[model samples]
Target chain A: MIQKGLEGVKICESSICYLDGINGRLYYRGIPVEELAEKSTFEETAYFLWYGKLPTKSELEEFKRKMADYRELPAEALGILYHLPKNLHYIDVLKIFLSIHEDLREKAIRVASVFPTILAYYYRYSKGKELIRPRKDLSHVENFYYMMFGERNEKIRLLESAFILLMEQDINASTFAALVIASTLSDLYSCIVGALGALKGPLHGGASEKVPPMLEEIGSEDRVEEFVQKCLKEKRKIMGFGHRVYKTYDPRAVFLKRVLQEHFPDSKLFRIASKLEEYIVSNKIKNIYPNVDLYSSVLFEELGFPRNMFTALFATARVVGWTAHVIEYVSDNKLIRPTSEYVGPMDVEYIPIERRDE
Target chain B: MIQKGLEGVKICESSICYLDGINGRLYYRGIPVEELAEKSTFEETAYFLWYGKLPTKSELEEFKRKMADYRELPAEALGILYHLPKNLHYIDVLKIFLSIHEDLREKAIRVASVFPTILAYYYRYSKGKELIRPRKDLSHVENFYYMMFGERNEKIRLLESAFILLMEQDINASTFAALVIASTLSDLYSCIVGALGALKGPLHGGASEKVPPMLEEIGSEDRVEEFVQKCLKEKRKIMGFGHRVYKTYDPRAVFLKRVLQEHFPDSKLFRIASKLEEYIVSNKIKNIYPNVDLYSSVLFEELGFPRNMFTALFATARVVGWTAHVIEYVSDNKLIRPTSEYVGPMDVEYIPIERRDE
Candidate 1:
């Protein structure tokens, strides 16, 4: 039997992530995501994911220092950005930049550490601004904040929590894509790049990128119902709404929503988003709920993340989970080469060039 | 139940390419690969894969023209080559160059066409030699041969048949990798690059790259049995001997071996390879066999192709099959996200730094 979307099949037994889509639950290495987001710093959360246990205070101190030390991009590697095509999204650029990098999951921290730097540089370079280098004095998320905006704020923990939330989900399309490449024993760069490629599509993390534009179109809280209704009437996909896994609200979205409300209650974008969510939930035919993109986009936009680079940020966090699977798969790996039924015609005649027209 | 490596799982129904692994059979769009390799030119074979039918004389000519025209690499795209990393393989560099490209399957032939040009340029550039651009007058495979070695030959048809043979098989790891990315509705470049990433792995097409070194180590016909016995005794993989899919003989390898024997009967690499294969087959306990890499690597080496570039050429030829699957997937697209069962511990306490050590 064939499952067109692999709907019920499990590729492997992965202990890295567990999801209860029916009950709105997710855990990374057995720890509830909400707890990880709320209590853990970005460095501490990543350490748990990569190492599979909470490190000692000294262990975390050593780990953070190692991550920060690997944050700088090589000068030669950065030069490719000078000739990058204008049509590419930030994810495509990141995929290209990773080619010069070669690593195993042990070097996972290096790729994760440098993503923010590469992201912030491209953001500036795309706008005719100077590229800011990474600062060792700051922490992981703090350094990223400094590099991007030339300043850091206590509110940046919202970004930290968001990163922790997005760090690992179940075997998502992007995550599965990473596993497929890694199963072949391909390099870690290919695995991450393959994941980014899948994440760029609208059906996956690409929905996050579209959320900002949808909010801009709605423009005001008063237009929420009308805009959403008309778009639904026309059968346009309401970006950041329903998800394949979660029939209820995306638990990740719930956490992001609470944080957004607490931090930026008066934000017009959040106000519009909440109104839109209210309308969709109240009049919905099914248990369709807002996905993580629904609120993360608002939070990121409110926090000055470039709207177009939203998917890139998702990739930076998700690379942790991607590499987690890479590590797990490599430990007891097999090639994930599945079978396909060939239904095309067979035994066709090999005709001469002149006889092919008939 | 979870199947590790997705063993025996079929991702989807398809008519693109079919394989009868037990029978050692493969077909593209219902036409046997050997017949296509015998009669069809590279352009015709790719066109058949893309469009699902053979073209008439005039149609074939027009398709060739269009494919050749797209063979030129953009000046801006080639600039990244100047900064290419020394440690990266040709496949990794190709993946990087493609990130600057964004396209659909309609642009498939463009990618398939330009891959050989990219391969040639990097081969020369890697050697401190000058680059040779694609010439319009040459045919699809001819231009590639011309660009790489600065000449052409009637004997290059063996290369043509080898390319046509490797053009597409069934849902192997790399082809499946491309489908995984394309299933998310990612762009064509991502699909091709993802496939390249998977193909570079030693378990997949990467086996061919290893074949050259193994033969080089064995060095002579007299060493064949000793080399095989020693490697097998130590539990080291005899690089090109066995396969997971083909139990008897790899059908594709049979074709390449025949062509090599007819074309270069006295080739040292081929002589050693044949002796090794005979020794393994005659003395083997079970039904083990040599894969396509065993002979294809020798054939590729004998043709003056740089030994290091063997895997790159495999990717170049296989891009046709990769795009074929991409086109088919887009026709009936679905997000191919699979599930995972996490057997990890749950409800661990999120300890503060001071309490974490215990």
Candidate 2:
């Protein structure tokens, strides 16, 4: 009745990839996401999203060099962060750190360019890490891993590749929020705030953390199908299945599944989860097949990451996609306005506050 | 065709007051604004806006006492404020100060209770004054003035009346911005950030500063009429005239005018501005007439405020209204989505860089 909730609304079309949910396929900037995930790094994916193409060897080297230089936030921002409450929510710390620029008016553009790096650094430091300085020689993906763990490894490319495959979904909560701010033709900062708020919600980006616990609860290979069946029968919307826009399989899931299979060719959990996914689809009970969340859980868990860091890692990589979309929206700024079906009482009478308890 | 730009959106309706533009009348909680301005103190007026009625003896006393108790910011916040760049825009400083309390989530609501006092203190301290600590014994309006100038006078009541009168109008930019965030149903801090951003823009709450300069530029009684005529001839929309909703006169202006005449009986600017209104209306040159901006300029100037402080003071008073509206919007939490007409070229080709600029 609400015209399929903007079914045909061209929010923005990307040359980056197209998701044909009905057929389960994904392409990244004209190349399949599978190829990128298997062969490329996060820095390479970020370059593709930002410049609209894969960078040549020299261009990639130049971009990574520029990114490493922006890792330092202004000194005043550091002073403020030092005084923030120890138990503060990470998102709040991120918000304050982002806004602490001293020369905000004059350097809005420069500040925006380095915002993602600042956010990743603040996230680590707020958790009590000695600040990991950015190394100019490291690639984008490598630097993100280095900042968090104090070392770089080949897994950086794997994580970065997975992240590239994750960016720019059509209907994530943060994307909707960004579109709402964009609809109003607000400034870039407001749109970014909206995106950050969206990512903080447990229903969206926060769900990345939820998957590891669910897997941990399943405990072993023998219980995988039984556990998933129980979750489906209880009518719970499983964390990684059946997104609002994807009535069939999520295309990213298909590609990610291949990467998981290729990387951990002999993993029992990976084999069990893949079989469980096949069983769920074959039975046609809930008919809910795996989405990106299913395979990503295995991939992140296999990488020795703690469950809580999953969403924060998602945020770190998603920054490139978020900024690209925000920049595009601001350049053609429009206020996003949508309608709701009213469901409140038709007639209501006000009661005085004194009589409310009765 | 655009439907009054942004009028008649019905943000929240209370019997508190109605703007009768045609006759230029204003009432608070159904009592006339002029009566409160002339007969009551600022503390009484603030109490009336927050609570439903004019405060009696003990109610006024308790409100003043509560305001005084909450005036000082945490020592940590003050330290952070002291370190903020002196060249920072006033709104940015206010935002940074607020963000320092993000994780102490309770502080937002508690701090909101004394927002006016907090703002006044910050403003004075930024100007390098010995912080005028709050006086528990005085009314809210009186205490704010005491903080501003470090002394109290009979003019405190008039100033208080003006402060309360400034609180509500049809959804201004800040509230509209709040609606943008509220649509997402995000956390309190996000909504607060959006509101602060809206307040910083010149097309909205910043008009208080714009008005006094126009008055200063004109400078004499004889020049007022010619200035209005020339401004109209140039199709320039004069500050403080016309209403977003009121087709004729702003209802609040009538009550404000009465207050100016009664409290500052010797002020020539108000008299000249009033006559200038007649010249424009009689000449049939433009439908615009004096709104609150017209008289408040002279009233604030006569009260000895420097021109730039006009909007800062507006921010102080309007913080109360913004807080109240945010709480109300948060309760129902419907996303305000509007439609837009797409006018851009569709299906444009993305050309490769080397093929063009190089």
Candidate 3:
């Protein structure tokens, strides 16, 4: 059977994560995402995704220690990071720097640990500011915040909540890309880099980054209706509105919206996004609902991230998922080589260069 | 029906290339690979793959001119290339330097043209020798050969033939990875880089690189029988003997073997490889036959390329095909997100961190 986009085509059996579109639910290894988001730390959650069960206290401590120990970039990787041009995108820096490592569990751990460090370094270097080293004393999310902003506060908890929520979401495009590469028996680093390349696309992880510019274009609460109407009339997709899977709201968006309400209730960007969501849903726009991108963008922007960094942050969160999927898939490997149906003209004659028309 | 490795599953309709397994044939845009390998230049074949037909004389000229014009690396990309650690693989260098560009046709042209430049520069730099600049006066394969070895000789035609032969195949793992990335509306550069990562895997393009070592290990003709028996008894698959698609011999291998016979009539490597092929076939190994890697590896080794460079050269040729597929897939875009069935524990409870068991 030919399945364009492989929609509804189950390729393999996986235990890492599941998405239930009918009920707008997501689960990580049988634990509902809401429970994990509310209660788990990034370290414990990453462990759960990788090992298939929750870590005990002693195991969790060891995991955190390993994560922290691996957070510092190797001297060579650091040199490459610094040598990269200031104008390069953060994702590019990641694809380049990460490709040098061989694929393995320890390499995966080192990459996941040092992801935020490299990102923060690139962000600072681009701005001509001094880079901050990763802090061993801070938790995973807290250290990421400290490295990027050089300060940590109460908002780091909210960021941690968001990271857990974004950690894994079944086999989406990026995760699928990761699996495809891993199926080739490529290194873990190649799988992650391939996944990052897919995530950088506008239709995938780049969706979140596009949301703020869309809100900025909408400007205010009053402008939401007309802007959406104009977009619908022109058949332009509203950036954060619809999803391929969820018929209702995205489950992760529900958690992110709660985070926004509890934290940045008075921010103007929040107001704009909420109103835009209300307008789209109220107009009976037929299956269009705010996915995770709507609130995630506003929350990220409110936390002082620039618009371009939204996808990079999404990548940082999704790396755990990518790594987990790669490890699981590579354990029982097969090359994911799909066939294409030929639809072009057949039996065309090859013309010599001298006989070709001008 | 679940299809692991996407075997026999047609994901999309493509006109770029086709593989007929039963007949052991490959076609690019309806012209058999053998025809193109004998008659077409790399520049013209790349254009045909992208544009759906052979270009007019004027169009071919313009294409060659543009290709030559874009062959030089940007100063920023060069800096990153030089700054990379000497121990890094050549594929990593390509992944890093190419990831910095924006996705566009012009960017695609620049990448395809300068891929050899970046690869050659990295190769020379790793050897601690002076890097050679690409010569604008030479053709694509000629310049690549010149840059890599600092001289153009009789081997340039053989190199060109190999490039043209490797330019495109149907939706294999790497090409499928490229399409998957392109489906997300990512940049062409990301798609190519992602494909490169997949190509670096041992089961994919890396298969050819493994061939020479196996041949060296086999040593003389008398050792071939025992080596084959040992490998069979151990249930170890030979690296270059089997393929998933071609039930008979790979047609590309037939052409490559012809190239080997024509150029290196007296090479001992060729003698060892041909004898090994004869032994495997005579033993009735059950669907085992020489694939492209068997002969391609011998030819590449004869041309003075190191074993590690085999996959990189495969990538250099395959990038043209990757660019063609990406451009075609993106023009009529769909996100290549596939589904997975859950087969693991699905109802586990989320235990409190404080109450977890050892």
Candidate 4:
């Protein structure tokens, strides 16, 4: 039997993240994501996912130290980043940076640390501007924001908390893509590169990037109802409203909404998003709850990032889970090879071109 | 109900290729690969797979002309190639080259033509040799061979035949990676880049590169029995002798073996491969049999290419199927997502580091 989209299919037994779509609960390493999002930093969340345990004070300090140390871009990668086509997407450049070397276990933190710099460099390169280098003294989120926008972010902790929430999930399309490639015993780099490709699709991580633009196109809070009605009649997809797995509210989205309300209370984007969500819900729009992408796109924009940087920012957080899952999978390896049901015709006679119709 | 490795799981239904593993049969677009292997050129096979029909003489010429025209790497890509770390694998370079641009349908043939050039350029770069560029007058295999070795090959036809067999298979690890990425409505470039990552695993296309080294270590046909016995006792995987799908034989291997015997009659790699096959078969090692990588490696070796070049060569052909499958799947798209069975505990109480045990 064929499973279209492999929906309702459990691909593997993973301990990294457990998701409950019915109850809308998510856990990483047996702890609720809400707990981590509330109390932890991105570096701590990474240590938790990768080591499957919370770190001690000294251990956490060393983790940050090493992560900060690896933030210096490999000289070769920097050079390659300089020459790539200006038209290329940020993730495309990230894919190449990830593929330049091998060594999965050690490479996880190494590449993850430098990801912000790579994305930042490409963005600057794409814009034909002078590139800004990383500052090691800052925390992960602080350094990342500075490298990207060439300015300090006093509100960086909010970004860090949001990143902790995005760090891992249970076998989404992109994570599954990682496992599939990693199952082949390919290097950690290839798996990340492949997962980034899967994530780049508009149906997955790419949705958040588009969500920012969609809100801009909708223009204001006043016309949200009209926009909603038009979309309903036209049957156009609301980019950030629906996800295949979640049926009720997305727990992550709820948390991000709280962050948005507290930080950007008067922001136009949040007001428009809230109005759109209110419309969809009151109109009984068939279980189409707002996904993490909706609030994430808003949060990213409010934090002074361009739309192209949205999905790539999500990846900077998700790379933690990507590395953690890869390590776990390779330790208990399988090929992740699935078969196909051939639905096309067979045993057809081959007609030579000379004898065929013109 | 987790399907580990996705064994026996049918992820999708399609007409691109059909494999009757027990009967050792294969077909592409409802036509036998065996028939295509003997009767078709690589260009014709690509045209058939991509267009889903045999092209007329004029159509075929235009296909070849356009393919040759796209052989020139975008200057930006060439520039990026010069800067990748020297330790990088050939496919890593190809992955970067592929990600430099977009446009699925048009970029398919364009990128496919330039694959060999990207790979060849990297190989020469790694060795500190002056690079060889592609010549428009040469055919697909002809130009590829000349660029890689800077010399004309009299036996280029044999290499092309082996490639024709390797062009497509039904949802193998690499092709499935492509489909999974493409299903996201991501561009064809991302899909191909992701597939190359999957293919780079030691268990997939990377196997072919290892086969030549294994044959060299085995030394001669005289030691086949002892080597086979040693590998069996040590539980070492013979790189080229087995596959997951085919229970009796691999149809592509059978065709490739025929090509190998006809041209490289005195090849040491072929002799070692055949001897190992003989030893395993006579000893009744159950379902184990030679796969296409076995003979494909031998033919690649006979054609004067290096070990690093083997899998990249495989990609040059497989890119056709990767492109064909992407176009088909996106036309009938669905996110290739599968859920996970969370095997870890839940609701563990968070403890502060100060109160935790040392």
Candidate 5:
């Protein structure tokens, strides 16, 4: 049977992650996302995803040490980042600089460690700020925060929570692209870079980046109803609202909302987002519910990320998932080649150039 | 049923190209490859692939003019290429430089035109030869030849034939990757770049590049049988012999072999390849047959392409197919997010890091 978009086709078997869309739950190696986000560090979550079990203390330490050790970017990669045009999108910058040469495990480690560095470097360089070198003393999450903001604060925990939450989702478009590339036996860098390209699309990781600007355009709580009604009437997609898989409110969004309420209960953006959500639900707007993007965008804004940088940050977190998928897919690899039902004509005679009609 | 690697799954509909594996036939927009290779220019074939019909004389002229106009690389892209590390593989160079920003049609034309120039420039620059600028007076294939060699010879026609033959195939791994990316509504550059990454795998475009070295290792007509027997005995893949889809002799290989016989009748490499083909078929070693890569590799070598550049050249031709698929897929796009069955243990307890095994 032809499944357009491969909507529900089980293309392969995996052990890394699973999405229970009916229950609005996601898991990494059988651990619920909420539990991981609340109880574990991003490093632990990543190790769990990759190694199929939580790391022991010493194993975790060694993993963290290796990650910190590889945090520094190669000078040539830094040069490429520095030389990229100012107007280029941050995702493009990530794509350019992350094009590196490494084997599977080495490339995975380097990509995960250096992603934040690349993002921060491009952020600083494009703004004409002196680039901050990665701090060896900081954790991966803290180092990214430090590099991007020039300081570390208590919000490091919140940043880590977001990263852990975003780290993996089961075989979404971007992850599937990564797996497809890896199934061809391509190197990890190519897989991750291909995944990043998919993430740049507005329909995937780029969806979260659009949420902040969308809320801003609606301006305040008072405009929520009018904005949504106009959009719905015009048949424009409300970027952060509906998902293909999730029928219930996304569990990640529920966790993010709890984080926002606990951390920034009085934040106006949070109020605006809540107001929008209430308006949409109250109006029965085609049964659309909030996915992760709606609340995550608010939290990212509260965390001081620029709107455009949101997708790059998402890629940084999702690189863990991408690499994990690449490792898993390559273990039992086959070429991910699928057939297409050709709808074009066949057997037409080729006409010569001069005899062709104008 | 889980279809690992999506083998034998019809994932979507395309009006671009079709493959008949049983007959070992490939067609683009209803035209058989043989007729297209014999009669059409690369530009016209590309137009047909993209537009789903043959172009009128004026449309063809305008298309040619636009391709010519977009042949020069942007200074920024050129600068990135120049600054790329000296030891980087040509495929990596192609990946880095082909990253671009434009709307769909414009991006498509720019990519198709600039691809050959980027390739030729890197080829000359890496060899420390003077960079040849793109010529407006030449056709796409002719300009590529002129840029690479600084002169067009009778070989340009042969080069054109190979390219036209390669310009499209059914939904192979690389084109599927392109479609997967485009289905997410990613930009054309991302789709094409993602496809390039998939094409770099040894199972795909990299297959052709490995062929010449294997032929060279076999050394002569006398060694061909022994080499095939040894490889078959050890269960090692003969690099260019079999294909995933083709059951009979690949029509492209047949056309390419004919091209060699007619054009370079006395060529020793051709003779060696023919002998290898004869021995493989006669021995009945797993019923293998020659695919496109066997003769294509010899043709590329005869055109003076370094073995490493073989895949990149394949990408140059296949970019036409990639963009055509991207254009078609994006018209009625859906996210190509296939599901994966969970194969790992579930209901595992999440142990606290310190409490885990030491």
Candidate 6:
């Protein structure tokens, strides 16, 4: 009986991609993430995840064309999205659309085979428009932007890179939990559902969204050290400071920092953030280096993504990885049930609430 | 850091329940499960989860009255349910209904405040038109039966106890995943949405539903040994055996076994099942004993629940627990990201798919 929370379990062998947290590296079909970030589109990434390698020029063309065509969502799901409140959180709206599907088998399959496209459609429809079907003509990243905003800009290339980086983390809580759940030989949809549940947390997907606002509040160079100190003193988790396993550096962050410097040359946010990073490092309060979330804020802000949609955008990209993990887990399976370290008062009195003083 | 999957790390002193995998014991509130099964109502157990004590006559009466009032689905949600495909899995329907109100912030709050009643309405809407509204006069268990089947019988009494016995467990994969997600500081609805995803798995909530059918497929007493042996030889897991943490016995199983015996004195299913247990012990196959699912098949069958609804029914009971865990995690949270031992191919030549052999 292994007590280490399904630790060391070889749940799946995904040809889609791999993450080496210790080295802070990611590979898709064994190509370094840096290369993919530099050259690939989200659509290309999706194709790579699904088929195990990048598509050729003609193959990429066909892939984009097919994805563009597939961007349209079921009318019923679309109809429900229209009725959703304009003020509704985008993630909540996506969750709603996700549930309204009349086709469980198709949805289950799509949870693996077509989630990136479906996610694109949901983003499109949430804006009260028809879904942009998956295209076979565009590269992976370009097609995602095309579907999301009905347009793509090369200026947002770093944003696309950030999306790819976020999608390549070593097992986050929900994905691992999903693998554990999938190990029980459950349906693919449930695994995605669990992954979605895990991703909704501010800690994982939410961190990127939180960073921009924190950056805004920190405002200028003079405020940086004080803000960092306040965050440290309150024991408030500085969202993007550290990694649990990657003691040296988060490779994605390094790549993102380069993207910020190369693509958004005029942006001051990164410079200020770099200074803040130095301050936090000097303080030695935490050894964890900046993760994908920190540099993503700089990229996202430069791309005009609202502070709120940062996490939603992450969700859109991460959905691909979640789908890949779900499919992989089902291909090899086990049930994930873990023990808790329960600490509570000794068993003695069951005094009724009314009998006890507040 | 400490990932022990199912080795009991500590005790919950307040809980009457003890998950002893080897000894096979489960109690509720203060009483043993057998006594509770024989004596209590579903309303009583639900009351216990919420209020943390067994309900008195007046308390039970009032709780039932409130639940009944909450039984009616919102006309908006019911309208959508009416249009949902009848062939769709019930869990999908649940997701759809929750999704319909995703824009409703109030809906999320209501779920946290009153999930049991909300789920009751959702379940009733999904079930066919035996459209019994909640009875202000009936107990919670009694009203659930009334809504589920349009009648209350002796089986409801047993099913209620069975439901309570089913509710308490160290968080399973889905619930744990949901909590881990919640640790990210997601909203109440997002947490539930994620948990719903996990519950749809056949391994966790879905397994209980499979048992009755497995028994039905096996069909006779003589086939029990062969069926169990076949499942074992194929490495196809028996749903109710070998829990993640509980290496001895699923504490609830012992109590459920008693309930099955007392409720259906002449049931051949029970008699055959007992012999199968003996065979399992004799063969040293199951190191501990049966889980809540073992007798759950017998109990649900007696309650006239369809085999298809078994997983949904488990969802119905577990929502209460899920709500509790969500609330608990919200109180003291950490983003649950863990390190994975990455095992995958390192960097290799990137070849276009068209250039490679398909």
The residue-by-residue lDDT of candidate 5 on B1-358, one tens digit each, is 7878777788778778888889888888788898889888889998888777788888999999999999998887777766677666677777777664426866787788888888889888877788899989999999998899888798888888899898888788888888878877878888888888888887788888878878888999999989987997897878778777888899999999998998877778888899999998887778889988889889999888888888888888999988877877777777888888888777777887768776
Tens digit of lDDT per residue, candidate 4, span B213-313? 89999999999888888888998888887777888788888888877788777988888898888888788785599888888888888877777778888
Worst 10 residues of 3 chain A by lDDT: A99-108
Candidate 2 lDDT, A132-246, residue by residue in tens: 7767677666676676678778776668777877766543556545554444444455545556655654445655656666656776667867887787678555666655456
Local lDDT at B228 for model 6: 84
Best-matching candidate per TM-score: 3
Best by DockQ: 3
* Backbone clashes under 3 angstroms, per model: 1, 11, 1, 0, 0, 45
Please give each candidate's TM-score.
0.96, 0.70, 0.97, 0.96, 0.96, 0.83
lDDT of 6 at B83: 51
Question: Per-residue lDDT tens digits of candidate 1, residues B175-215?
Answer: 99899889877888887888888998888888888888888
Clashing pairs in 5: none
Cα deviation of B189, candidate 6, in Å = 3.5
Per-candidate iRMS values, in order, are: 1.6, 8.1, 1.5, 1.6, 1.6, 5.4
Query: What would the per-residue lDDT of candidate 6 be over residues A1-358, giving only the tens digit for each residue?
Result: 3222233434344555666656776676577878777766676776676666567777867766665555555666545544444444555545555554414223433543344455555555555677677666665556666766778787656666777666655467666655655655555555555566566566776777777767778887788988877877898888777765566667778898888877776677887777777777676657667887898877878886556566667766776776666665555554556545433223334344345333
CA lDDT, every model vs. true structure: 0.84, 0.59, 0.85, 0.84, 0.83, 0.62
Query: Compared with the true structure, what per-residue lDDT tens digits does model 4 show for residues A1-358?
Result: 7887888898777888888888888888789898989888888889888877888888889999989898887787777776777877778878877777725656898889988888888888888899888887888888888877778756787888889989998788888888888888888888998889888889998999888778878888888888888888998888888877777889999999999999998889898898888888787786688999999999988988777778788899998898888888788788877778888887877677788778
Which of the predicted structures, 3 or 5, would earn the higher DockQ when compared with the native? Answer: 3
Q: Candidate 2: list runs displaced more than 4 Å.
A: A1-69, A101-109, A120-129, A158-191, A194-358, B1-69, B101-109, B169-172, B183-185, B213-244, B257-315, B319-358
Which candidate comes out best when scored by lDDT? 3
Q: What is the TM-score of chain A in candidate 4?
A: 0.95
Runs in model 3 with CA error above 4 Å? none
Poorest 10 consecutive residues by lDDT, candidate 1 chain A: A100-109
Q: Please give me the DockQ of candidate 3 compared with the native complex.
A: 0.75
List of clashing residue pairs for candidate 3: A103-A188
Residue pairs with backbone atoms closer than 3 Å in model 4 (clashes): none
Give candidate 1's error at residue A324 in angstroms.
Answer: 1.1
